[PDB]
Amino acid sequence: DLPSIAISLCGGLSDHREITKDAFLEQAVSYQQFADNPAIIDDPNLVVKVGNKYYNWTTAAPLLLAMQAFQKPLPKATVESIMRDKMP
Amino acid sequence: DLPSIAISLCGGLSDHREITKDAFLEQAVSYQQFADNPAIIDDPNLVVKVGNKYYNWTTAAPLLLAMQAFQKPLPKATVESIMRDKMP
């Protein structure tokens, strides 16, 4: 019931570029890849796809914590506020 | 099937103290509390309980990202490695 999550190293947020599905998919991070290098989570090019939206880690973090701690997403208005504070 | 997650502002990790269940529960963070102040995620006293273990946010982050991106936890040996790198 929760929105799906996927991660990629395609980058493109800090420079404010329009991210393509195929670019995201081409650099998707696998479980084995992440387990072998958990520091991927600190890579500035990490993009987190939540449902149909692309976020950086700093914005995705509170969204993902709320989903797993409370089994429901944050309110849309809260997400928009977090984006204003933590998205590039 | 995934381990349960809960969050609290009880603190006690950076000073290396032995955290009590009741202290964690007394300062548990609610959904409304987190939605009203998502910056709680940056509070140094934030403790993340994953299953039966207490982590700080920097350690919990890759564990929670892997659970939601891959629908399974990281290997125990990987978690132990992350703890050595990111736990206080």
Swiss-Prot record, chains A, B:
* Superkingdom of origin organism: Eukaryota
Q: In which tissues is it expressed?
A: Specifically expressed in skeletal muscle. Also expressed prominently in adipose tissue, and testis. Lower expression also detected in kidney, lung, brain and liver.
What conditions trigger expression of this protein? By fasting, glucocorticoids and diabetes in the liver in a PPARGC1A-dependent manner. Up-regulated during differentiation of 3T3-L1 pre-adipocytes.
Q: Which disease is it linked to?
A: Defects in Lpin1 are the cause of the fatty liver dystrophy phenotype (fld). Fld mutant mice are characterized by neonatal fatty liver and hypertriglyceridemia that resolve at weaning, and neuropathy affecting peripheral nerve in adulthood. Adipose tissue deficiency, glucose intolerance and increased susceptibility to atherosclerosis are associated with this mutation too. Two independent mutant alleles are characterized in this phenotype, fld and fld2j.
Family (UniProt): Belongs to the lipin family.
Q: What does this protein do?
A: Acts as a magnesium-dependent phosphatidate phosphatase enzyme which catalyzes the conversion of phosphatidic acid to diacylglycerol during triglyceride, phosphatidylcholine and phosphatidylethanolamine biosynthesis and therefore controls the metabolism of fatty acids at different levels. Is involved in adipocyte differentiation. Also acts as nuclear transcriptional coactivator for PPARGC1A/PPARA regulatory pathway to modulate lipid metabolism gene expression.
Q: What is known of its domains?
A: Contains one Asp-Xaa-Asp-Xaa-Thr (DXDXT) motif, a catalytic motif essential for phosphatidate phosphatase activity.
Subunit structure as annotated in this protein's UniProt entry: Interacts (via LXXIL motif) with PPARA. Interacts with PPARGC1A. Interaction with PPARA and PPARGC1A leads to the formation of a complex that modulates gene transcription. Interacts with MEF2C.
Protein name listed in UniProt? Phosphatidate phosphatase LPIN1
